[PDB]
C-alpha cells in the first residue's frame, strides 16, 4: 500500500500524467499503476522539456526497470533511484527521482 507516498499516483493513465508533469520542473516524478498489464507500474518523469515513461517489471521474485538491477520491492526500487541517477540504465535520462509530484 503506497497511497501514503507523495510520489504515488495510483491508477493515473498516460494522458493525465503527461498533462500534469509537463508543467513541472525537470526531475518531477510519479509512480502509477497499470492494472491491465504484465508490467503493473510505470515511472513517469519530467526531464528536459519532455515527460518520459519507464515500465516497472515484476519477474520471478523481483521488481526492476532493468534486469541488471533487481529489487525485492517497489519501495526499494524507488528509494534507489531517488539517490542514484537513472543514467546508469538510460543514458539520455540523467536525473534522479528528485521531486515527488505531490510535493
Amino acid at each position: 500500500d503506497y497511497t501514503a507516498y507523495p510520489w504515488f499516483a495510483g491508477n493515473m493513465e498516460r494522458q493525465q500524467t503527461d498533462n500534469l508533469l509537463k508543467s513541472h520542473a525537470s526531475g518531477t516524478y510519479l509512480i502509477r499503476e497499470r492494472p491491465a498489464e504484465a508490467e503493473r507500474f510505470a515511472i513517469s518523469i519530467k526531464f528536459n522539456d519532455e515527460v518520459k515513461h519507464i515500465k516497472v517489471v515484476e519477474k520471478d521474485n523481483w521488481i526492476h526497470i532493468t534486469e541488471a538491477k533487481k529489487f525485492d520491492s517497489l519501495l526499494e526500487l524507488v528509494e534507489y533511484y531517488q539517490c542514484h541517477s537513472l543514467k546508469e540504465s538510460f543514458k539520455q535520462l540523467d536525473t534522479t527521482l528528485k521531486y515527488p509530484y505531490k510535493s
Binding site: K52, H53, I54, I65, E67, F90, K91
Partner: peptide, 8 residues
C-alpha cells in the same frame, strides 16, 4: 519515439 524508455 518509443512509448516507454528502451532499456539498452
Amino acid at each position: 519515439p518509443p512509448c516507454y524508455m528502451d532499456v539498452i
